[PDB]
Amino acid sequence: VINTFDGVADYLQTYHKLPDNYITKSEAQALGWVASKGNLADVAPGKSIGGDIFSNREGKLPGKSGRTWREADINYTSGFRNSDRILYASDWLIYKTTDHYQTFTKIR
């Protein structure tokens, strides 16, 4: 599984897409995922949540018209989701978060 920051970021860059292990929460919900139960590994073995649009409500991330930000879970294996996320733009700027969207740092 390609679920590490470096794996995802190198990948995102050479393929312009998320690796195979990711699904959206809506997708995830459709196969039986309940956030309150921390059961994703059960309904969707070996997958993590990633590919939903991050709204960038608080302008912490570089803005531009035509630019869309997207999110994805990092270092997930089973249980409750962690606080680790990767944020990628349509123009392919990659940022990381480890504090649940509070602070962002450039990775690519």
PDB file of N, CA and C in Angstrom, residues 16-103:
ATOM      1  N   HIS A  16      -0.289  11.686 -11.839  1.00  0.00           N
ATOM      2  CA  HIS A  16      -1.363  12.682 -11.872  1.00  0.00           C
ATOM      3  C   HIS A  16      -2.702  12.229 -11.314  1.00  0.00           C
ATOM      4  N   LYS A  17      -2.614  11.144 -10.556  1.00  0.00           N
ATOM      5  CA  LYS A  17      -3.751  10.522  -9.904  1.00  0.00           C
ATOM      6  C   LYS A  17      -3.241   9.869  -8.608  1.00  0.00           C
ATOM      7  N   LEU A  18      -4.315   9.626  -7.859  1.00  0.00           N
ATOM      8  CA  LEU A  18      -4.172   8.916  -6.570  1.00  0.00           C
ATOM      9  C   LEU A  18      -3.965   7.429  -6.949  1.00  0.00           C
ATOM     10  N   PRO A  19      -3.199   6.831  -6.051  1.00  0.00           N
ATOM     11  CA  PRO A  19      -2.964   5.416  -6.108  1.00  0.00           C
ATOM     12  C   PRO A  19      -4.379   4.818  -5.818  1.00  0.00           C
ATOM     13  N   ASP A  20      -4.485   3.574  -6.182  1.00  0.00           N
ATOM     14  CA  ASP A  20      -5.558   2.605  -6.164  1.00  0.00           C
ATOM     15  C   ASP A  20      -6.283   2.327  -4.865  1.00  0.00           C
ATOM     16  N   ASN A  21      -5.560   2.468  -3.778  1.00  0.00           N
ATOM     17  CA  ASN A  21      -6.053   2.267  -2.421  1.00  0.00           C
ATOM     18  C   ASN A  21      -6.985   3.359  -1.916  1.00  0.00           C
ATOM     19  N   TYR A  22      -7.248   4.421  -2.664  1.00  0.00           N
ATOM     20  CA  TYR A  22      -8.099   5.471  -2.101  1.00  0.00           C
ATOM     21  C   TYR A  22      -9.494   5.478  -2.658  1.00  0.00           C
ATOM     22  N   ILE A  23     -10.431   5.918  -1.914  1.00  0.00           N
ATOM     23  CA  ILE A  23     -11.821   6.060  -2.228  1.00  0.00           C
ATOM     24  C   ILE A  23     -12.263   7.288  -1.450  1.00  0.00           C
ATOM     25  N   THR A  24     -13.323   7.856  -1.962  1.00  0.00           N
ATOM     26  CA  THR A  24     -13.952   9.073  -1.373  1.00  0.00           C
ATOM     27  C   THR A  24     -14.837   8.675  -0.182  1.00  0.00           C
ATOM     28  N   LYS A  25     -15.174   9.681   0.673  1.00  0.00           N
ATOM     29  CA  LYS A  25     -16.010   9.231   1.795  1.00  0.00           C
ATOM     30  C   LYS A  25     -17.402   8.788   1.340  1.00  0.00           C
ATOM     31  N   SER A  26     -17.864   9.390   0.259  1.00  0.00           N
ATOM     32  CA  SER A  26     -19.215   9.068  -0.246  1.00  0.00           C
ATOM     33  C   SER A  26     -19.230   7.634  -0.734  1.00  0.00           C
ATOM     34  N   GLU A  27     -18.211   7.214  -1.446  1.00  0.00           N
ATOM     35  CA  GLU A  27     -17.948   5.888  -1.951  1.00  0.00           C
ATOM     36  C   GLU A  27     -17.939   4.801  -0.850  1.00  0.00           C
ATOM     37  N   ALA A  28     -17.153   5.180   0.130  1.00  0.00           N
ATOM     38  CA  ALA A  28     -16.821   4.622   1.418  1.00  0.00           C
ATOM     39  C   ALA A  28     -18.181   4.439   2.136  1.00  0.00           C
ATOM     40  N   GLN A  29     -18.989   5.456   2.253  1.00  0.00           N
ATOM     41  CA  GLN A  29     -20.296   5.330   2.882  1.00  0.00           C
ATOM     42  C   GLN A  29     -21.252   4.322   2.262  1.00  0.00           C
ATOM     43  N   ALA A  30     -21.125   4.231   0.961  1.00  0.00           N
ATOM     44  CA  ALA A  30     -21.927   3.343   0.116  1.00  0.00           C
ATOM     45  C   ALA A  30     -21.650   1.873   0.368  1.00  0.00           C
ATOM     46  N   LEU A  31     -20.388   1.569   0.672  1.00  0.00           N
ATOM     47  CA  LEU A  31     -20.020   0.180   1.032  1.00  0.00           C
ATOM     48  C   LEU A  31     -20.176  -0.239   2.500  1.00  0.00           C
ATOM     49  N   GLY A  32     -20.831   0.490   3.324  1.00  0.00           N
ATOM     50  CA  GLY A  32     -21.056   0.359   4.727  1.00  0.00           C
ATOM     51  C   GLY A  32     -20.200   1.122   5.722  1.00  0.00           C
ATOM     52  N   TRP A  33     -19.312   2.018   5.289  1.00  0.00           N
ATOM     53  CA  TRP A  33     -18.506   2.751   6.324  1.00  0.00           C
ATOM     54  C   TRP A  33     -19.329   3.666   7.252  1.00  0.00           C
ATOM     55  N   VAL A  34     -19.155   3.572   8.552  1.00  0.00           N
ATOM     56  CA  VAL A  34     -19.808   4.408   9.562  1.00  0.00           C
ATOM     57  C   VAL A  34     -18.615   5.032  10.320  1.00  0.00           C
ATOM     58  N   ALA A  35     -18.478   6.342  10.259  1.00  0.00           N
ATOM     59  CA  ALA A  35     -17.320   7.022  10.952  1.00  0.00           C
ATOM     60  C   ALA A  35     -17.331   6.661  12.444  1.00  0.00           C
ATOM     61  N   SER A  36     -18.435   6.676  13.128  1.00  0.00           N
ATOM     62  CA  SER A  36     -18.528   6.362  14.520  1.00  0.00           C
ATOM     63  C   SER A  36     -18.091   5.021  15.051  1.00  0.00           C
ATOM     64  N   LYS A  37     -17.972   4.091  14.127  1.00  0.00           N
ATOM     65  CA  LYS A  37     -17.631   2.689  14.421  1.00  0.00           C
ATOM     66  C   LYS A  37     -16.172   2.337  14.096  1.00  0.00           C
ATOM     67  N   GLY A  38     -15.517   3.151  13.308  1.00  0.00           N
ATOM     68  CA  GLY A  38     -14.138   3.100  12.865  1.00  0.00           C
ATOM     69  C   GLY A  38     -13.926   1.796  12.155  1.00  0.00           C
ATOM     70  N   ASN A  39     -14.885   1.426  11.296  1.00  0.00           N
ATOM     71  CA  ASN A  39     -14.938   0.132  10.545  1.00  0.00           C
ATOM     72  C   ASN A  39     -14.486   0.140   9.100  1.00  0.00           C
ATOM     73  N   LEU A  40     -13.837   1.064   8.473  1.00  0.00           N
ATOM     74  CA  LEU A  40     -13.406   1.122   7.079  1.00  0.00           C
ATOM     75  C   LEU A  40     -12.663  -0.084   6.543  1.00  0.00           C
ATOM     76  N   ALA A  41     -11.779  -0.574   7.426  1.00  0.00           N
ATOM     77  CA  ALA A  41     -10.936  -1.752   7.129  1.00  0.00           C
ATOM     78  C   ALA A  41     -11.834  -2.989   6.941  1.00  0.00           C
ATOM     79  N   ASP A  42     -12.975  -2.928   7.596  1.00  0.00           N
ATOM     80  CA  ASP A  42     -13.918  -4.041   7.469  1.00  0.00           C
ATOM     81  C   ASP A  42     -14.680  -4.081   6.146  1.00  0.00           C
ATOM     82  N   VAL A  43     -15.176  -2.965   5.716  1.00  0.00           N
ATOM     83  CA  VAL A  43     -16.029  -2.799   4.540  1.00  0.00           C
ATOM     84  C   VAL A  43     -15.252  -2.585   3.247  1.00  0.00           C
ATOM     85  N   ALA A  44     -14.023  -2.094   3.440  1.00  0.00           N
ATOM     86  CA  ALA A  44     -13.104  -1.718   2.382  1.00  0.00           C
ATOM     87  C   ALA A  44     -11.648  -1.987   2.758  1.00  0.00           C
ATOM     88  N   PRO A  45     -11.415  -3.304   2.840  1.00  0.00           N
ATOM     89  CA  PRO A  45     -10.080  -3.810   3.203  1.00  0.00           C
ATOM     90  C   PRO A  45      -8.954  -3.141   2.441  1.00  0.00           C
ATOM     91  N   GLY A  46      -7.905  -2.752   3.138  1.00  0.00           N
ATOM     92  CA  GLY A  46      -6.740  -2.139   2.475  1.00  0.00           C
ATOM     93  C   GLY A  46      -6.932  -0.848   1.757  1.00  0.00           C
ATOM     94  N   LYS A  47      -7.946  -0.054   2.008  1.00  0.00           N
ATOM     95  CA  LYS A  47      -8.252   1.275   1.472  1.00  0.00           C
ATOM     96  C   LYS A  47      -8.274   2.293   2.650  1.00  0.00           C
ATOM     97  N   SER A  48      -8.088   3.502   2.124  1.00  0.00           N
ATOM     98  CA  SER A  48      -8.078   4.777   2.857  1.00  0.00           C
ATOM     99  C   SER A  48      -8.914   5.824   2.067  1.00  0.00           C
ATOM    100  N   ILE A  49      -9.292   6.840   2.862  1.00  0.00           N
ATOM    101  CA  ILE A  49     -10.065   7.947   2.270  1.00  0.00           C
ATOM    102  C   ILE A  49      -9.123   8.984   1.637  1.00  0.00           C
ATOM    103  N   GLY A  50      -9.457   9.324   0.384  1.00  0.00           N
ATOM    104  CA  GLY A  50      -8.680  10.385  -0.313  1.00  0.00           C
ATOM    105  C   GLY A  50      -9.369  10.724  -1.643  1.00  0.00           C
ATOM    106  N   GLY A  51      -9.226  11.975  -2.114  1.00  0.00           N
ATOM    107  CA  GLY A  51      -9.710  12.500  -3.369  1.00  0.00           C
ATOM    108  C   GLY A  51     -10.836  13.521  -3.344  1.00  0.00           C
ATOM    109  N   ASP A  52     -11.323  13.760  -2.101  1.00  0.00           N
ATOM    110  CA  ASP A  52     -12.381  14.783  -1.892  1.00  0.00           C
ATOM    111  C   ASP A  52     -11.616  16.125  -1.916  1.00  0.00           C
ATOM    112  N   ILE A  53     -12.347  17.109  -2.338  1.00  0.00           N
ATOM    113  CA  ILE A  53     -12.046  18.514  -2.572  1.00  0.00           C
ATOM    114  C   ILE A  53     -11.938  19.164  -1.219  1.00  0.00           C
ATOM    115  N   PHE A  54     -10.820  19.851  -1.120  1.00  0.00           N
ATOM    116  CA  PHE A  54     -10.688  20.509   0.235  1.00  0.00           C
ATOM    117  C   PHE A  54     -11.043  21.951  -0.111  1.00  0.00           C
ATOM    118  N   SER A  55     -12.016  22.410   0.659  1.00  0.00           N
ATOM    119  CA  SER A  55     -12.562  23.769   0.412  1.00  0.00           C
ATOM    120  C   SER A  55     -11.674  24.947   0.718  1.00  0.00           C
ATOM    121  N   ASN A  56     -10.623  24.799   1.479  1.00  0.00           N
ATOM    122  CA  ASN A  56      -9.710  25.951   1.784  1.00  0.00           C
ATOM    123  C   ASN A  56     -10.385  27.279   2.187  1.00  0.00           C
ATOM    124  N   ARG A  57     -11.387  27.052   3.024  1.00  0.00           N
ATOM    125  CA  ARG A  57     -12.255  28.021   3.682  1.00  0.00           C
ATOM    126  C   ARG A  57     -11.414  29.140   4.280  1.00  0.00           C
ATOM    127  N   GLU A  58     -10.414  28.728   5.043  1.00  0.00           N
ATOM    128  CA  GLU A  58      -9.579  29.756   5.762  1.00  0.00           C
ATOM    129  C   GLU A  58      -8.338  30.293   5.093  1.00  0.00           C
ATOM    130  N   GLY A  59      -8.292  30.190   3.791  1.00  0.00           N
ATOM    131  CA  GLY A  59      -7.197  30.646   2.958  1.00  0.00           C
ATOM    132  C   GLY A  59      -5.823  30.271   3.500  1.00  0.00           C
ATOM    133  N   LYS A  60      -5.672  29.201   4.289  1.00  0.00           N
ATOM    134  CA  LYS A  60      -4.311  28.897   4.759  1.00  0.00           C
ATOM    135  C   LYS A  60      -3.446  28.441   3.604  1.00  0.00           C
ATOM    136  N   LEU A  61      -4.010  27.849   2.594  1.00  0.00           N
ATOM    137  CA  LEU A  61      -3.348  27.299   1.402  1.00  0.00           C
ATOM    138  C   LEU A  61      -3.360  28.240   0.209  1.00  0.00           C
ATOM    139  N   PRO A  62      -2.227  28.322  -0.497  1.00  0.00           N
ATOM    140  CA  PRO A  62      -2.098  29.165  -1.670  1.00  0.00           C
ATOM    141  C   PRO A  62      -3.332  29.155  -2.562  1.00  0.00           C
ATOM    142  N   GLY A  63      -3.881  30.375  -2.661  1.00  0.00           N
ATOM    143  CA  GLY A  63      -5.076  30.565  -3.514  1.00  0.00           C
ATOM    144  C   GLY A  63      -4.759  31.026  -4.923  1.00  0.00           C
ATOM    145  N   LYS A  64      -5.722  30.736  -5.790  1.00  0.00           N
ATOM    146  CA  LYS A  64      -5.646  31.070  -7.230  1.00  0.00           C
ATOM    147  C   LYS A  64      -6.962  30.643  -7.870  1.00  0.00           C
ATOM    148  N   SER A  65      -7.408  31.472  -8.821  1.00  0.00           N
ATOM    149  CA  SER A  65      -8.686  31.081  -9.508  1.00  0.00           C
ATOM    150  C   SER A  65      -8.252  30.106 -10.628  1.00  0.00           C
ATOM    151  N   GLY A  66      -8.963  28.975 -10.512  1.00  0.00           N
ATOM    152  CA  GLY A  66      -8.698  27.862 -11.457  1.00  0.00           C
ATOM    153  C   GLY A  66      -8.029  26.638 -10.835  1.00  0.00           C
ATOM    154  N   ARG A  67      -7.553  26.816  -9.626  1.00  0.00           N
ATOM    155  CA  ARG A  67      -6.869  26.010  -8.662  1.00  0.00           C
ATOM    156  C   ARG A  67      -7.830  25.210  -7.789  1.00  0.00           C
ATOM    157  N   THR A  68      -7.764  23.911  -7.803  1.00  0.00           N
ATOM    158  CA  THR A  68      -8.732  23.244  -6.841  1.00  0.00           C
ATOM    159  C   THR A  68      -7.887  22.427  -5.898  1.00  0.00           C
ATOM    160  N   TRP A  69      -8.161  22.504  -4.603  1.00  0.00           N
ATOM    161  CA  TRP A  69      -7.353  21.727  -3.632  1.00  0.00           C
ATOM    162  C   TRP A  69      -8.055  20.388  -3.354  1.00  0.00           C
ATOM    163  N   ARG A  70      -7.259  19.349  -3.170  1.00  0.00           N
ATOM    164  CA  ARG A  70      -7.769  18.022  -2.798  1.00  0.00           C
ATOM    165  C   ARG A  70      -6.943  17.406  -1.635  1.00  0.00           C
ATOM    166  N   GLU A  71      -7.706  16.635  -0.858  1.00  0.00           N
ATOM    167  CA  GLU A  71      -7.235  15.925   0.325  1.00  0.00           C
ATOM    168  C   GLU A  71      -7.206  14.402   0.241  1.00  0.00           C
ATOM    169  N   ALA A  72      -6.356  13.866   1.136  1.00  0.00           N
ATOM    170  CA  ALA A  72      -6.178  12.371   1.205  1.00  0.00           C
ATOM    171  C   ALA A  72      -5.504  12.014   2.513  1.00  0.00           C
ATOM    172  N   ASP A  73      -5.954  10.943   3.131  1.00  0.00           N
ATOM    173  CA  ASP A  73      -5.468  10.398   4.409  1.00  0.00           C
ATOM    174  C   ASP A  73      -4.067   9.804   4.301  1.00  0.00           C
ATOM    175  N   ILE A  74      -3.204  10.056   5.268  1.00  0.00           N
ATOM    176  CA  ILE A  74      -1.865   9.420   5.160  1.00  0.00           C
ATOM    177  C   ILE A  74      -1.716   8.525   6.367  1.00  0.00           C
ATOM    178  N   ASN A  75      -0.914   7.512   6.223  1.00  0.00           N
ATOM    179  CA  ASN A  75      -0.506   6.482   7.166  1.00  0.00           C
ATOM    180  C   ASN A  75      -1.663   5.735   7.801  1.00  0.00           C
ATOM    181  N   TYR A  76      -2.756   5.539   7.044  1.00  0.00           N
ATOM    182  CA  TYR A  76      -3.899   4.789   7.602  1.00  0.00           C
ATOM    183  C   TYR A  76      -3.830   3.300   7.359  1.00  0.00           C
ATOM    184  N   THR A  77      -4.171   2.577   8.426  1.00  0.00           N
ATOM    185  CA  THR A  77      -4.236   1.100   8.265  1.00  0.00           C
ATOM    186  C   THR A  77      -5.577   0.609   8.755  1.00  0.00           C
ATOM    187  N   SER A  78      -6.048   0.830   9.944  1.00  0.00           N
ATOM    188  CA  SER A  78      -7.375   0.297  10.317  1.00  0.00           C
ATOM    189  C   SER A  78      -7.896   1.204  11.407  1.00  0.00           C
ATOM    190  N   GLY A  79      -9.016   0.974  11.985  1.00  0.00           N
ATOM    191  CA  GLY A  79      -9.523   1.825  13.029  1.00  0.00           C
ATOM    192  C   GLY A  79     -10.118   3.105  12.522  1.00  0.00           C
ATOM    193  N   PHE A  80     -10.067   4.074  13.449  1.00  0.00           N
ATOM    194  CA  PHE A  80     -10.491   5.487  13.391  1.00  0.00           C
ATOM    195  C   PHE A  80      -9.463   6.207  12.517  1.00  0.00           C
ATOM    196  N   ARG A  81      -9.917   7.175  11.738  1.00  0.00           N
ATOM    197  CA  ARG A  81      -8.932   7.880  10.849  1.00  0.00           C
ATOM    198  C   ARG A  81      -7.921   8.644  11.685  1.00  0.00           C
ATOM    199  N   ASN A  82      -6.724   8.925  11.176  1.00  0.00           N
ATOM    200  CA  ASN A  82      -5.756   9.714  11.987  1.00  0.00           C
ATOM    201  C   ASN A  82      -5.920  11.197  11.646  1.00  0.00           C
ATOM    202  N   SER A  83      -4.872  11.957  11.931  1.00  0.00           N
ATOM    203  CA  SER A  83      -4.797  13.436  11.720  1.00  0.00           C
ATOM    204  C   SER A  83      -3.911  13.953  10.566  1.00  0.00           C
ATOM    205  N   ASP A  84      -3.310  12.991   9.902  1.00  0.00           N
ATOM    206  CA  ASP A  84      -2.423  13.025   8.776  1.00  0.00           C
ATOM    207  C   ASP A  84      -3.107  13.054   7.397  1.00  0.00           C
ATOM    208  N   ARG A  85      -2.753  14.097   6.684  1.00  0.00           N
ATOM    209  CA  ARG A  85      -3.364  14.325   5.401  1.00  0.00           C
ATOM    210  C   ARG A  85      -2.374  14.965   4.461  1.00  0.00           C
ATOM    211  N   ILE A  86      -2.655  14.730   3.197  1.00  0.00           N
ATOM    212  CA  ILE A  86      -1.846  15.318   2.118  1.00  0.00           C
ATOM    213  C   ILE A  86      -2.866  16.208   1.389  1.00  0.00           C
ATOM    214  N   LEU A  87      -2.456  17.354   0.890  1.00  0.00           N
ATOM    215  CA  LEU A  87      -3.276  18.350   0.168  1.00  0.00           C
ATOM    216  C   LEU A  87      -2.553  18.625  -1.145  1.00  0.00           C
ATOM    217  N   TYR A  88      -3.223  18.340  -2.207  1.00  0.00           N
ATOM    218  CA  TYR A  88      -2.703  18.498  -3.543  1.00  0.00           C
ATOM    219  C   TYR A  88      -3.699  19.351  -4.336  1.00  0.00           C
ATOM    220  N   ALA A  89      -3.090  20.170  -5.175  1.00  0.00           N
ATOM    221  CA  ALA A  89      -3.715  21.097  -6.092  1.00  0.00           C
ATOM    222  C   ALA A  89      -3.645  20.545  -7.550  1.00  0.00           C
ATOM    223  N   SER A  90      -4.575  21.203  -8.277  1.00  0.00           N
ATOM    224  CA  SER A  90      -4.760  20.842  -9.700  1.00  0.00           C
ATOM    225  C   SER A  90      -3.542  21.163 -10.560  1.00  0.00           C
ATOM    226  N   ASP A  91      -2.717  22.052 -10.013  1.00  0.00           N
ATOM    227  CA  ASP A  91      -1.475  22.557 -10.613  1.00  0.00           C
ATOM    228  C   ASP A  91      -0.272  21.842  -9.985  1.00  0.00           C
ATOM    229  N   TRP A  92      -0.645  20.916  -9.087  1.00  0.00           N
ATOM    230  CA  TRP A  92       0.268  19.996  -8.435  1.00  0.00           C
ATOM    231  C   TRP A  92       1.310  20.487  -7.459  1.00  0.00           C
ATOM    232  N   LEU A  93       0.834  21.295  -6.547  1.00  0.00           N
ATOM    233  CA  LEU A  93       1.603  21.845  -5.421  1.00  0.00           C
ATOM    234  C   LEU A  93       1.195  20.849  -4.307  1.00  0.00           C
ATOM    235  N   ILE A  94       2.147  20.274  -3.577  1.00  0.00           N
ATOM    236  CA  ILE A  94       1.714  19.350  -2.510  1.00  0.00           C
ATOM    237  C   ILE A  94       2.134  19.876  -1.123  1.00  0.00           C
ATOM    238  N   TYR A  95       1.200  19.840  -0.193  1.00  0.00           N
ATOM    239  CA  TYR A  95       1.280  20.263   1.190  1.00  0.00           C
ATOM    240  C   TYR A  95       0.891  19.031   2.001  1.00  0.00           C
ATOM    241  N   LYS A  96       1.296  19.050   3.226  1.00  0.00           N
ATOM    242  CA  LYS A  96       1.083  18.085   4.284  1.00  0.00           C
ATOM    243  C   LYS A  96       0.480  18.789   5.497  1.00  0.00           C
ATOM    244  N   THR A  97      -0.201  17.974   6.281  1.00  0.00           N
ATOM    245  CA  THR A  97      -0.793  18.341   7.551  1.00  0.00           C
ATOM    246  C   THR A  97      -0.673  17.070   8.424  1.00  0.00           C
ATOM    247  N   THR A  98      -0.452  17.294   9.706  1.00  0.00           N
ATOM    248  CA  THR A  98      -0.326  16.272  10.721  1.00  0.00           C
ATOM    249  C   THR A  98      -1.122  16.707  11.927  1.00  0.00           C
ATOM    250  N   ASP A  99      -1.853  17.790  11.863  1.00  0.00           N
ATOM    251  CA  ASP A  99      -2.599  18.341  12.987  1.00  0.00           C
ATOM    252  C   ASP A  99      -4.041  18.659  12.618  1.00  0.00           C
ATOM    253  N   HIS A 100      -4.478  17.758  11.714  1.00  0.00           N
ATOM    254  CA  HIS A 100      -5.894  17.960  11.312  1.00  0.00           C
ATOM    255  C   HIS A 100      -6.210  19.329  10.765  1.00  0.00           C
ATOM    256  N   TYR A 101      -5.604  19.648   9.632  1.00  0.00           N
ATOM    257  CA  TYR A 101      -5.754  20.875   8.853  1.00  0.00           C
ATOM    258  C   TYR A 101      -5.380  22.204   9.532  1.00  0.00           C
ATOM    259  N   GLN A 102      -4.785  22.140  10.707  1.00  0.00           N
ATOM    260  CA  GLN A 102      -4.400  23.416  11.372  1.00  0.00           C
ATOM    261  C   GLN A 102      -3.198  24.053  10.704  1.00  0.00           C
ATOM    262  N   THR A 103      -2.070  23.462  10.541  1.00  0.00           N
ATOM    263  CA  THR A 103      -0.843  23.964   9.914  1.00  0.00           C
ATOM    264  C   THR A 103      -0.520  23.103   8.696  1.00  0.00           C
TER     265      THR A 103
END
